[PDB]
Design an enzyme around this catalytic site. Sequence first.
Site, mmCIF file in Angstrom:
data_model
loop_
_atom_site.group_PDB
_atom_site.id
_atom_site.type_symbol
_atom_site.label_atom_id
_atom_site.label_comp_id
_atom_site.label_asym_id
_atom_site.label_seq_id
_atom_site.Cartn_x
_atom_site.Cartn_y
_atom_site.Cartn_z
ATOM 1 N N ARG A 186 0.822 -1.210 0.000
ATOM 2 C CA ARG A 186 0.000 0.000 0.000
ATOM 3 C C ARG A 186 0.856 1.261 0.000
ATOM 4 N NH1 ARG A 186 -3.652 3.612 3.876
ATOM 5 N NH2 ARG A 186 -1.709 3.748 5.080
ATOM 6 N N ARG A 244 -7.084 18.521 8.057
ATOM 7 C CA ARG A 244 -5.802 18.403 8.756
ATOM 8 C C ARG A 244 -5.347 19.716 9.391
ATOM 9 N NH1 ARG A 244 -3.566 13.234 7.658
ATOM 10 N NH2 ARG A 244 -1.722 13.780 8.905
ATOM 11 N N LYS A 256 -13.119 2.221 0.917
ATOM 12 C CA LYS A 256 -12.869 2.275 2.354
ATOM 13 C C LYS A 256 -14.085 2.825 3.090
ATOM 14 C CE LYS A 256 -8.672 3.703 3.671
ATOM 15 N NZ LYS A 256 -7.585 4.713 3.811
ATOM 16 N N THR A 286 -6.213 -0.440 10.029
ATOM 17 C CA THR A 286 -6.060 0.365 11.259
ATOM 18 C C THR A 286 -6.127 -0.431 12.568
ATOM 19 O OG1 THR A 286 -8.390 1.119 11.473
ATOM 20 C CG2 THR A 286 -6.925 2.453 10.078
#
Lengths: 504, 413, 508, 498
Positions: free
Chosen positions: A50, A97, A243, A301
């Site tokens: 990935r 962010r 996802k 995760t």
Amino acid sequence: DTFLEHMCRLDIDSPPITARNTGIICTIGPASRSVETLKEMIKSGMNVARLNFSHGTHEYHAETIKNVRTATESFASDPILYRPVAVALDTKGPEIRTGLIKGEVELKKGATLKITLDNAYMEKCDENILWLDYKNICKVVEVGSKIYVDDGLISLQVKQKGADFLVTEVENGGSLGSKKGVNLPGAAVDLPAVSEKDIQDLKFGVEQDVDMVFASFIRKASDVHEVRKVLGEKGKNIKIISKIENHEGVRRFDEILEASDGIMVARGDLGIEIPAEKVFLAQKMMIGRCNRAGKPVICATQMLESMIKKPRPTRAEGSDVANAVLDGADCIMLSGETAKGDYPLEAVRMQNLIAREAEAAIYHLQLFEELRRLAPITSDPTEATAVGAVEASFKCCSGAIIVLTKSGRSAHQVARYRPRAPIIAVTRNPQTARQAHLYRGIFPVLCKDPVQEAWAEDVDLRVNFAMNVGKARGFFKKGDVVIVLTGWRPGSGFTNTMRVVPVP
Amino acid sequence: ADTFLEHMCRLDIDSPPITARNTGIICTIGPASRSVETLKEMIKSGMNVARLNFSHGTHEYHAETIKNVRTATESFASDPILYRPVAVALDTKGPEIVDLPAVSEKDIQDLKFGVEQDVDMVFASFIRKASDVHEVRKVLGEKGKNIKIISKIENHEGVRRFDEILEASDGIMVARGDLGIEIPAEKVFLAQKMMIGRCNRAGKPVICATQMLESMIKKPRPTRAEGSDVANAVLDGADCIMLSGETAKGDYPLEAVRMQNLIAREAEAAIYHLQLFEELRRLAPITSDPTEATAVGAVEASFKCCSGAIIVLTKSGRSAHQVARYRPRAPIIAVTRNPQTARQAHLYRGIFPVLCKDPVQEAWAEDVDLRVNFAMNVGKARGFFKKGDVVIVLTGWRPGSGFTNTMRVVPVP
Amino acid sequence: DTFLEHMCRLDIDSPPITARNTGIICTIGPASRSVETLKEMIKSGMNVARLNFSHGTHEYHAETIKNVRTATESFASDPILYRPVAVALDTKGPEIRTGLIKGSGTAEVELKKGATLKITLDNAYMEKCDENILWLDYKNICKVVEVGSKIYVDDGLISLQVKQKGADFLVTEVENGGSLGSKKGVNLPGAAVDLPAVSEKDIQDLKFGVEQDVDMVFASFIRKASDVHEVRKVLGEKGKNIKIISKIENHEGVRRFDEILEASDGIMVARGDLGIEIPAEKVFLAQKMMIGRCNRAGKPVICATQMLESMIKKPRPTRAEGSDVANAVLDGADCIMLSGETAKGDYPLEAVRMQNLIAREAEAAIYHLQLFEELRRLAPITSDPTEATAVGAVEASFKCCSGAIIVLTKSGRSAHQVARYRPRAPIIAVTRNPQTARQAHLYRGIFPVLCKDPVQEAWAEDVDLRVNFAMNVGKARGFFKKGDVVIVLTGWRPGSGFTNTMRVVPVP
Amino acid sequence: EHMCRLDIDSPPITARNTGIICTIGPASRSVETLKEMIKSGMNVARLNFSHGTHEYHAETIKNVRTATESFASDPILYRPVAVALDTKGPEIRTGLIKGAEVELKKGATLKITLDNAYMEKCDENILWLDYKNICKVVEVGSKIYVDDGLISLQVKQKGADFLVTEVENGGSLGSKKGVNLPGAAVDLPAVSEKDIQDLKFGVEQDVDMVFASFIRKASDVHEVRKVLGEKGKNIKIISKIENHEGVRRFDEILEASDGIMVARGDLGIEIPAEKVFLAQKMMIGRCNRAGKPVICATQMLESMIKKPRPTRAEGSDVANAVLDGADCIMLSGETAKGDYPLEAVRMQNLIAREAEAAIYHLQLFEELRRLAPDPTEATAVGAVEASFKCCSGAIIVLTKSGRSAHQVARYRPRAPIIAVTRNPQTARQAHLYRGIFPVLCKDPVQEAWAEDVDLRVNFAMNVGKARGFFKKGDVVIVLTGWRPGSGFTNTMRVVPVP
Ligand SMILES: N[C@@H](Cc1ccccc1)C(=O)O
Ligand SMILES: N[C@@H](Cc1ccccc1)C(=O)O
Ligand SMILES: N[C@@H](Cc1ccccc1)C(=O)O
Ligand SMILES: N[C@@H](Cc1ccccc1)C(=O)O
């Protein structure tokens, strides 16, 4: 005979001679970027690499892919032991962010924090002022809303809504670093699923010849097809893994699954959006549905997060990764463990052990018993052969199910029924060999031999190639019997030929 | 649902839990939860068994806690319909730094103190073999013969010699954190699943302890990894979940109990009761004991004629215990006049024990009807069933029966 | 899913849409020897032609066999609609017969109930029998019977009980009375009669069958495993491919059934003379036991005698006979044999037609799924590809609701192993061997077809031609249509060791 | 399959679970003969009201009861015997032979007349029958069957009161033999004047069941129910299916009837002979699915009227009736007028006991469970479910009306169902249902309820041990109510045999 007694026979002192059927996906970063380290990681059991496009440039990731493919082709000299390594592109998506720290700051509970949109304090964040890149933040959340920063380790509460700022009270403190992800649960996030940056990165994947794409923050079916359009005609073969990382994605899962090639379950990002006491249900729901439809499912995760600093994982992590495998996950992904961790090789090596031990606790018979009862009553030649092959694999105590395939679709249809025997997928297509790792139980092999003039000569050559590799990986001995799946005529359209051949 | 995969597929996180929380909740009572007012709120929130860690604190300190537990419990005794029995557990210290004595001088003193304090169960620490279980049984003697011994598996040798321990013990505790340092971490889950499975087969209770909700000591909410860790433990077939430092010394004790109820009730929706019973019926030695025959027949009827509950009139608890080993979907309402068995019944998953305080009627049949009517009123108040529903009543045949062999299909009045 | 449900929704006003899967065997005698009748009998259903060698000379049967083949090969001009007709030789077997009563063979003496009677082995009484004295051609009578045994004379009408034994004489007590004629069959219940497996005539008849190129032999009066191998050795290396069907005719055959079955290719249950030996309330259990054991083994079983005996004189059978035949089919019998109905009766054509009607009506009452389900679990664990592919084909036949299972076989074996597991779909056995096509009728469910095409040099093409041949016949018989899907079993390469290859193919 | 495990040498290790109904005529009318018939296995005594006077049948019933109550001294070994009344119905019968049987030959001409002067002068040329409207409902080419279908005739010429027929299937013609007209609109009433008088007499004689002849539709059963009325509300009506319309309109008949009789002999004439076996399996199957008793009648052991032993074809047929799922199997001429009446009942017991060894009871139960759509029913399923699980010796059922035990037999258990009852009529009627062993309790009702149950369970436990159903150490299942004067039979207890 029974799942209960199958659990009773589990011995911890007995070594597991069951193949590690799940695929290991590793995030490649600064700590595993080098060619030499990748060589060892492939040997340890890395199947898919990935690349997280949330950080780094196109040029940076281009050199990473080159190092991945160089380490992979170092085993190309021996095709009997060669392992195909897939390349994955994880998109940034609609992220919020934080900025930079002036001159990590320590946040105390009950303290006043001002989240501003003023680009003057963009790179000057402290214990009083904070900056983020989502300009429509004060337009989506009201007074009393919870703002989560950095994996949800820092929680905030909006006391008063401002014009270009937000006055917040710190509920949970910690070390607030630079450039940290911001979550807004229960907000009308009006960012596009495929941003202008995503369009740039997705087209670079087409040019870098990626095998799969991990599309971030997928909420609906129209989002998946927007990714499909950007890939276009040149990237029609690239598998789209959507996802799931919010409540909407869980709500509208059926339309996402039906539009996507596969699903990635991000349990960390989901745990911030939805209550923690419901995340295990969502994981077990989504994995089960992906098993029903026969589409790959990846668990991401919070897998071995402790292994970033320690050479050993904890008890809870080992139990959590294993339970994901038992739920029926095809793949399990490593994030910061392999990306920037101090022990990247060990993070891969432990994952092999955790997944291989979980295999002994899987009762395969029941899965096939249940999947065929939900399998639609159809007259499809490939589907009838798929059921028949797995049915015969259990009864013949088969060492493997050898599947000759070009597209992979026939091998994927065998994987849907979940057999005990590993599915050796013989192909001349290099991409479908890499993409086969998405599926549980499929052991892809790349036949480098040229197409034989006679059809029967070609089949027997490919079957004997799979027979050699299967003996090399200890799947079956001489006195064993395997199942071979092929077509009948050149340009068949259906893989409908099933034959029970004893191993030479 | 005809399929376990279909059962997982139909799961909805937005849907409120329909099934009641069948799992047991055990809480370590210490400085944080010692007070009567906090204990009262834990009983309301879902606490079933009170644990006392004898690793620290004097006999004076613990006797004050046991009194407070009973002070908080008996405040609800005014309403016999809504009253909940709360068990008292004694977690022995155990020898610490192997042929170290199974029961230390302190442990003997603590065990005999338990008999005096009238504890319901003993958590025997660091059990390695069958002789260790027998030595604990020896210390309790005739005065503590009705006290249940729950062996704590803490080491590698405890796993290796599990079968001789389980047969000798009354129950088992899986100390996952303690086992995690003894054996490799990538193997603990297999050991956990093996033990819980073998306990389910035997019909003897199993408890999950250590590293449950450790983050709730300082935070009012658990991490999602802990929510999964607790849920999977219940899904393995565990009867009770034990909280340690979250309730003992932590900043959020009451929140830890409420969060334990929420996780375990949510994990209840992911349980497939049709498979559990059918496998347990096949693996069970075919009768021929009249109780085991009636226990199987009642659990099968709970599915067949779609019952709301299984009403069992038990004295020692054993009858409800043998119905609990077959894992029914419908709750097992265990009606008893014995306080100890009402308290000890929380060890078994799927049992809702009710304490009948009514006097024994001279006519046996009338006393049975009175005990049944009480279970109807309790069941209706808890929302297990309504007037239209049908339930399965289990009784003995005559005054002083060795069997609970009588079974009735009875409509709710 | 329910077998009871099948019985509940049966309709008599509804004609049978289910296909007749059980083979029909007919005895060919005076009434059916004519080619014209044999042509019409094959059209009506006949699959196997039985020649009763108990009567008629070698010369007489040879013409009938020739007549059978003349009537069979008249349909050879159409390979799609051609049906192979098997030739069956039923042996005479060992038989105990009495002497002559007071001279003439037509003379008849009355017998008292409860009176004493004597049996002699002295040959001076062979034409001098009366009320007191009787003669038997069985020289070893004394060594097989004991004090208190039973002796039945003439089809079990006259029963006798031995009181005192001797060296070569037996004094007996009469229980059943009646008239006694000359030279009539004698039966011994529970006795292990040691008459040779093959008579001097049977040795001649079995060698004649090889010369006439028969497909199967109905070996009479089989009592032990060595009796079957005695017939096998007589047929020799030249007659190795001739199937041996053992006939159970007495109590010893039933008792020692397992050893007989493990030594034979098939079994015949002759309920008539088996009813003479063992009591009536036990014949049906013996029938249900033997048929069941044959299905588990995967070997053919045929029911015989007392079938449609009323059709010798009537154009329509009775109810009891209609139910009796149907029950035999429901028990799991592969074939159903006709005796005097087709051989010497007045209505031989009406008999074959009625057999088709009953055996097709019984097919609706059969629950096919269960038959396979019970036979799947009982199959011993083996990694033999031929049997492992056979179970998968029958598994798919119920799964994808196939019209038929097409099996390319040479010896028949591949089709036999599929038929063992009893699918609902017919087993089309495509073969080039003529004998294989004929012998396949012994198995229930197998619809054999004879490919007369030349062997194609490209192996894949030779398969496709044989599969398309079965596809043509399947449509013609109405088993399946264009929309349907079938299962095809083949080898892998020319001269394959096993029939390991299975295909799921749509019908063109 | 347990079919492979079958052995003819080993004695039957299971009880004869099916019922036996015997027709009582001149050859079995005596008390002495009746005693040994009950000993041999007779459960229900059928009285054929096609023949004999009311005075004749009343003495026969008396003889049945005199022979039954001789065993009343030992309640453990006592067996209840039911009385059945088989009605005449819409029957067509020939006249009387003059001067004896006449020879009818194939191809000959026979004249059928309605002349009352010829009613007692029947011969080879001329024949009389009682159906006065035969001319209006029959046509040229129609088939007329005589003497249970043994003799067949085809109509060649019609007349005002006569019919000219050609003998198609010849044979021997007796006196007053039965006549069939298949496919004819027979306008004879379902319940005749004689039928009314015979049914009212049945109520007077206190019969347990009525065998209703020639039932075509549901309203025929309702007409019979009306004639019985208030006084005979507890008499079970068993409708006989003897024609084609009875098969076509079967679902409506079964709903109105308490039970069904399959008259296979009469059915084989009215419909094609080949399709009868399907009709038998269909009618039995639908009766098992509905929980109502099914009886197989006619052509059972017919050769036993003349011979002392039946043919193997009869034995295989009788056994298959049981194997199809029949509750009872009825004997006609074998016990009524036959030379060997006692031997016929003993063959019946043997065949049905042998056929019992070929029944896979677990198959039947698992299939009857799913087709089932009440506490009494829920407890009835659980009792049968447990009986297999703990290899129970018996299922003891305390019942008043019998229904409780009938609910158990519906699911077809392997263990014998012992019905303990104080009601004499329910003890006799219980023989209709397969696997039910009724036992009559003559003990006074105990004041304490639990005492009355324990005494009755002991009574059933003594009976079971005497019959070989179970022994010391075995397990039985008891079904009761909860209190005296209760609704439902919802109590199930498992009890070891002392
Ligand atoms: N596909 C993965 C995992 C796997 C191994 C072995 C058999 C099946 C699957 C790999 O090849 O590494
Ligand atoms: N035994 C626990 C959990 C439980 C609740 C309800 C039904 C069954 C079990 C209690 O009663 O509190
Ligand atoms: N083999 C027999 C019976 C049969 C018919 C149809 C299908 C299968 C078998 C025939 O060809 O007539
Ligand atoms: N009902 C009959 C047959 C029967 C015998 C034994 C058990 C069950 C039924 C009887 O009691 O005589």
